[PDB]
Copies of this chain bind each other. A is one copy, B any other.
Amino acid sequence: VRGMNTSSAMSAFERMEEKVLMQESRAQALGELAGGSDVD
């Protein structure tokens, strides 16, 4: 399960998952920072 750390394998898996999500969030924020009615 996501929220418990009894197993080392899940610990590592979730840690890498969070690292990658953070990296993508960094990319998105950098996108924002530097910068359908009509077709409806």
Contacts and interface: CB of A to CB of B under 8 A. Distances in A.
Contacts of A1: 34-35
Interface residues on A, range: under 10
A36 interface: no
Contacts of A4: 34
Interface string A1-22: 1011000000000000000000
Contacts of A3: 34
Nearest to A1: B34
Interface of A: 1, 3-4, 34-35
4 contacts: A1-B34, A1-B35, A3-B34, A4-B34
